[PDB]
Structure formats: structure tokens, C-alpha cells
Design a protein around this ligand. Sequence first.
Ligand SMILES: [Mn+2]
Ligand SMILES: [Mn+2]
Ligand SMILES: [Mn+2]
Ligand SMILES: [Mn+2]
Ligand SMILES: [Mn+2]
Ligand SMILES: [Mn+2]
Ligand code: NA
Ligand code: NA
Ligand code: NA
Ligand code: NA
Ligand code: NA
Ligand code: NA
Ligand code: NA
Length: 333
Amino acid sequence: ETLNGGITDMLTELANFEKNVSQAIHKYNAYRKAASVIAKYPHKIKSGAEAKKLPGVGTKIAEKIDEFLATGKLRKLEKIRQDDTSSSINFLTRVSGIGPSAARKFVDEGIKTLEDLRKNEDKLNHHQRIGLKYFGDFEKRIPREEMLQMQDIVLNEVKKVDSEYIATVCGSFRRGAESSGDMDVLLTHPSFTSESTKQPKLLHQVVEQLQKVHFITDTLSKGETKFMGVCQLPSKNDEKEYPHRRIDIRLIPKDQYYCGVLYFTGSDIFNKNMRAHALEKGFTINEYTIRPLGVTGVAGEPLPVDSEKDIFDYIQWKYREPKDRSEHHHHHH
DNA sequence: GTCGG
DNA sequence: GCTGATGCGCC
DNA sequence: CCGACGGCGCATCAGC
Ligand SMILES: [Mn+2]
Ligand SMILES: [Mn+2]
Ligand SMILES: [Mn+2]
Ligand SMILES: [Mn+2]
Ligand SMILES: [Mn+2]
Ligand SMILES: [Mn+2]
Ligand code: NA
Ligand code: NA
Ligand code: NA
Ligand code: NA
Ligand code: NA
Ligand code: NA
Ligand code: NA
């Protein structure tokens, strides 16, 4: 059903090879960009020349597209698929906590399959152990209806610790997706701003309560402002158990909420595009601030921002609503 | 790998 | 302890 | 070996 679906799958697959196997993070991003603009292109691509007009598609991808349009495949990708070392490395990176470095190391030590991973628990750190343990569950997408139940648990229990926390479920959920990979919760509290931490355990207290009602079930990593863990909906009595889910919680300075929500709403590729455009307009954006770059490449004072749209306005973009910050594709008949 | 120099 | 590099993660 | 490319939190290491 997807317009230019073959091409866009081909680019995503090369991208992943580059990140996981080549550890070539810049080529990964070039292939992701190429895939993103091709998938948002509303016409069927017929040659490499055409694709080459799109920003981020250059001679080599045009050559591949030309090849893919002739044969319906890419010999470069056939070779990679036959390579059992690449394949196992690629696979191992899908476990949370195993990245391209650990995957390569595991694979040359004879750990090539899940079965092999579950045999060598003792080599895994705590993150990796938890990612192994929930590997199948984490592959499942969360239906928006379960996101609503998880939301109702998180808001209720946040309120119970302190009425002046505000929690906002961002990510794909806030962009309106019908399913989400995980749940990302943006949290503020007026004791925490860019200038002061008036209370010390602001994030912890929330996490503690979420463990106490048995909603958060495991921890991957945790600091003063970002928690990363596992969570799970409580089931109907006797009914089947719900799969475990990833949950991310980020506490942001109350007075930098808009930059924070912009960041945490994504998509990841919108953020990258938006922040790249800001750079070429002479601004630098992160989850806290938008700052102008000095003539010498150095960021100055933060600019005032009273809404998400103020940030767009600064870099001369039409405000795009959350739903329009997702990636999209087109269809053929 | 692509683009701005 | 601090700073800076590497690895892995978030959007 | 042209160099930038989005920006940063948490975990852990190295060197001081
Ligand atoms: Mn579709
Ligand atoms: Mn489009
Ligand atoms: Mn998410
Ligand atoms: Mn997440
Ligand atoms: Mn028809
Ligand atoms: Mn994501
Ligand atoms: Na097609
Ligand atoms: Na181009
Ligand atoms: Na991974
Ligand atoms: Na920890
Ligand atoms: Na489970
Ligand atoms: Na631009
Ligand atoms: Na205002």
C-alpha cells in the first residue's frame, strides 16, 4: 500500500546497517533523512535523477534507487543479509541496553541468538538484563486505549503526591497516534526551575509512588531529571496479564516548559529538522532554551518563549500542530 | 552520505 | 572530587 | 586526513 515503499524500506535497512554494524552514525542519519523525504514525497519515483532533486538524496542513493527500480533489490543489501555476523549484531542491538559496541563484542564471543543471550545473563549489566527479560513485550505497540488507562494511573498517582505536579503524556500519544511504542511523561513542579531546586527528591517521590501501587515494575536508569523504566497495566481478575511497557519520565524546569514539551513531543526527526533549521537561521535549540548564536559560533542568552509557537516564529516556521509533527507516508492504488 | 564551502 | 570520552538512550 | 551534521541525560571509565 505504501508509495515508494520498497525504496523507503531499503533506505531504513541501510540506515540500520550503518548505525549498528558500521557504527557510522552520520551515514545512519543521512539514510534516515533520505527515507524521510522520499516517504513524504507525493509522487511515485521513477528514476534516481528525480529522487536526487529532493534535499538529502545525492549520487549514491540515486544510484541505489536506480538499481532498486531495475531489479527490485539491492545487491549491497543481499550481501549484508547473507552475512550472519551482521545479522546477529543487528538483532542484538534491538535489546534495550545493547548498542552497536556491545552487540559486536557479544557476537565475536559466540553470542548470536536470543537463546544464546539468555544463556549468558552474567555478561549483561542491569539495563541489558531488564531489556532481555522484556524483549518480546517491548516489541508490541501500545493501543491508544491502553495509553488512556496508563495516563489515568499516572495523573491520579501524581496528584496524590502533590497537587502542584503537572504531568503531560508526550511522544506519539500527544501527536495523536492510534498506537505508541511507549509512554513518555513530561513532569513539572514549581520547586524546580532553571534557577533553583527548592525540593531535592522531586522525580524520585513520583517514581516511588508509582512503584508502591505496583505500576512501575523495573528501572533501567534513573537520575535527578530523567527516569527510564518498565511499567504495566493491572489486569481484570483472572483475565490475561497485560504486557510490560517502556516508560520514560522527564522532569523539566517549570519555566522552560515549552521548549521541553516541544522536545518531548517529537517526532525525533522533526526535532532534528527543526533544530537544523534553527542553526541555519542562527539559533540553537534544546529542550530547555532557544538561544541565538553569536558571530563566533557561541550561544548567548535564552530568548523569551511564552508558547510553543513562539519557538517556531523565532526560526520563521509556520506553527505545526503536534499531529503534523509525525512522519507520514503516501499510498498507491 | 550529503551538502556547503 | 572534577572534567572529558564512550556507550546507550530520549524526542 | 574538508568538516559539519541536533542536542542532551544517565552510567561508567580514564586521567588528573
Ligand atoms: Mn498507510
Ligand atoms: Mn507528503
Ligand atoms: Mn515514545
Ligand atoms: Mn520513550
Ligand atoms: Mn480500484
Ligand atoms: Mn522513539
Ligand atoms: Na510501491
Ligand atoms: Na539532492
Ligand atoms: Na539496543
Ligand atoms: Na541507576
Ligand atoms: Na511480560
Ligand atoms: Na530549512
Ligand atoms: Na507573552
